[PDB]
Symmetry: C3
Subunit: 242 residues, 3 copies
Amino acid sequence: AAAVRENALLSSSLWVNVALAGIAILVFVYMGRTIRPGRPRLIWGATLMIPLVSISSYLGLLSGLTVGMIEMPAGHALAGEMVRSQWGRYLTWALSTPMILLALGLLADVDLGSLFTVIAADIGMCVTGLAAAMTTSALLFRWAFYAISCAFFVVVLSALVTDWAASASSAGTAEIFDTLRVLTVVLWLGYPIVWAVGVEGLALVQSVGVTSWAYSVLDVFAKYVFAFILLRWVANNERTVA
Amino acid sequence: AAAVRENALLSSSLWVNVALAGIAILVFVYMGRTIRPGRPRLIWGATLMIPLVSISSYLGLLSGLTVGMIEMPAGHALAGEMVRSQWGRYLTWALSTPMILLALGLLADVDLGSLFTVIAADIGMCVTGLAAAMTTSALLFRWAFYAISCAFFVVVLSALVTDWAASASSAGTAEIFDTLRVLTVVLWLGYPIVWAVGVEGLALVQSVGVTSWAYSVLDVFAKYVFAFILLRWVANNERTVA
Amino acid sequence: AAAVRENALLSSSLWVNVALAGIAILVFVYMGRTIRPGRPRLIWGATLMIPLVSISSYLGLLSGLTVGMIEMPAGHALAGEMVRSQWGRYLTWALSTPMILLALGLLADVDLGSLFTVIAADIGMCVTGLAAAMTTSALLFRWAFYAISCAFFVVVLSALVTDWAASASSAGTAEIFDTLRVLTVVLWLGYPIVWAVGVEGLALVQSVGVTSWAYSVLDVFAKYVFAFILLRWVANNERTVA
Ligand SMILES: *C/C=C(C)/C=C/C=C(C)/C=C/C1=C(C)CCCC1(C)C
Ligand SMILES: *C/C=C(C)/C=C/C=C(C)/C=C/C1=C(C)CCCC1(C)C
Ligand SMILES: *C/C=C(C)/C=C/C=C(C)/C=C/C1=C(C)CCCC1(C)C
Ligand SMILES: CCCCCCCCO[C@@H]1O[C@H](CO)[C@@H](O)[C@H](O)[C@H]1O
Ligand SMILES: CCCCCCCCO[C@@H]1O[C@H](CO)[C@@H](O)[C@H](O)[C@H]1O
Ligand SMILES: CCCCCCCCO[C@@H]1O[C@H](CO)[C@@H](O)[C@H](O)[C@H]1O
Ligand SMILES: [Cl-]
Ligand SMILES: [Cl-]
Ligand SMILES: [Cl-]
Ligand SMILES: [Cl-]
Ligand SMILES: [Cl-]
Ligand SMILES: [Cl-]
């Protein structure tokens, strides 16, 4: 009744995005039929990868493959108990968020050196966040990993709001880039907040069902809506892009 | 006598490609002495990586490091039993098949945006195939991962037969690209067929020794012969390439 | 008293580089304030990643997350015993050493095809070294993985001393590249020597505390000093770089 409820929250939060990522893929494929070869097409290709990885991630979680139990260390609000960790989320982020950055990079026509550094920071962010969730020896080390993950996040964010914006300005896409960059910054910021507030961090919210739904809602925006906005603009501005 | 036989199939299927990848490396190194710096040399470098990763993979399997037992879920032809899974194959594919795609990409002088999307799809293909083999909770999830892996495969294939062919046409290598692309498409198609027919899928063939040999034969062609054909052509057409 | 000592060696060898990587990051960030957008800035960005990954690695080891016990196989000097393996080092090398190569690649303005092949070889080097440490079935397979790792290392080294030097010559950075390339070759050579001499290889040195310190000292030079030299030169030669 709390377990019926917690289990009902968890499964619905996962099955919803299997459906939505599935539909996004179908929609995005259809939209690509009318998109002309060249830069518009390259962006579409990168963009389509985003829900492809996302739906994989959610099947990872649903199947039990990428979900485990983790013993919280002394000092944690749930010290001495096992908590369900959806570590599959952090893992697949390391592949899906570089696809987001690649679509943006193509859109803003960034320097390849900047692209490689950003994607590398992004992967560091994801792996250290995973380390934070997986660490059981001490509460200190969990939050130390969280802080390093934040430092990686700052590298990515800084690049977006400076060099990538600059690149977009001279590539003639600064207006759509700024929309998407603002969307990206706001929504990505939600993930470390969920982590911190949720059961793996401070556990202000102790329901893993609630924290799971929080990530799932963020994904709807940071992936599927982000991508739909991108593809709509590209399909309407193919010459600006080429 | 079935176990003597199954064990004889397994070890021979693995030791043969330690030998063949070993020899391929030796041959390819020798061939590189006569290849001129620049684009020909870059292709040679990428090409040489292919059997380097391959021989690593086979030592992974031989040593027991990347082989495990997996319990088949209800509904599977071998439901309730443990089957030997050569999961090391899927793992190293995620590094060796991007090397194949990189050699082709250099040959066809493709757009870097296309290259990054293709290699990302390729990695998604490999990791979801690995997920399919590793999933034990339900038969549904195994085949769902298989279907996503196929979708990633289609992304890669589509890029080959369209944009990469286009790139090869304007880079003056469309004739050798078309040979290699056709080789690649036909042989790569064999892997999901082996998976499906073999013990991890439908188990029409229940011998892991037989399924292992099937992958090993595919590797001989998709890697070592593919690469030897590439290097022969490059060493004979260095100016067309430069 | 040997355990007090071995444990004192181990923890000090790990905490020292948490401190030093931490300080390097702080120093490098400060130095970046005075570095002009463009190629100098791109190098700085790539360079800053190096201690970011390094400090992550050391927290991985300190927390117990990426340290495990491994049973040495028959024939090993410590056959039948469990030895502490800092496998987290090999793992994070697969992300930090591509950042070193990326900073150099930007500095020498190398061909992207060369860059991708080198970074791929570099990752192969790291993963097969990890395989070597993780392999328990036979002593033969441990050293076979070590030899393949060496072959990957040779690919990387060959590229540095030939094509990358060539690129640096025509990009006008051959003098600073040659310093850094020589630094890189000498210090990187120290790692397989430590492996071989230390407890995981021949165990001429059986103290894991001593072997850990050896890696930690190599890191100080191959990462933090390497990077400080790079940033000093870039900040003093911004026009040569642009
Ligand atoms: C599609 C998935 C997305 C856009 C996920 C983005 C995730 C992040 C920006 C996560 C950030 C984190 C930190 C910055 C600190 C450590 C905890 C994390 C991993 C949640
Ligand atoms: C050198 C190794 C090669 C060329 C391996 C290629 C492997 C594939 C094309 C595998 C494809 C698969 C699917 C498309 C569905 C899921 C099962 C796989 C991973 C066998
Ligand atoms: C910052 C970390 C660095 C620069 C580490 C570099 C590590 C190597 C060059 C390791 C090389 C190895 C071999 C060449 C053989 C197998 C054992 C290794 C992994 C130590
Ligand atoms: C996100 C910015 C603040 C980070 C918190 C610093 C680490 C504190 O750590 C927290 O201490 C609490 C006990 O006091 C517990 O309730 C939490 O479970 C534990 O994570
Ligand atoms: C490859 C295209 C067809 C995929 C098969 C769909 C999934 C069916 O699944 C299969 O069902 C069988 C029992 O009927 C078993 O024999 C198999 O082990 C099991 O994989
Ligand atoms: C690094 C170049 C030499 C590699 C050594 C070849 C592999 C030998 O292997 C070694 O054999 C010894 C027993 O004779 C043991 O002391 C070692 O633990 C074992 O690694
Ligand atoms: Cl994802
Ligand atoms: Cl869950
Ligand atoms: Cl392989
Ligand atoms: Cl096997
Ligand atoms: Cl590291
Ligand atoms: Cl340790």
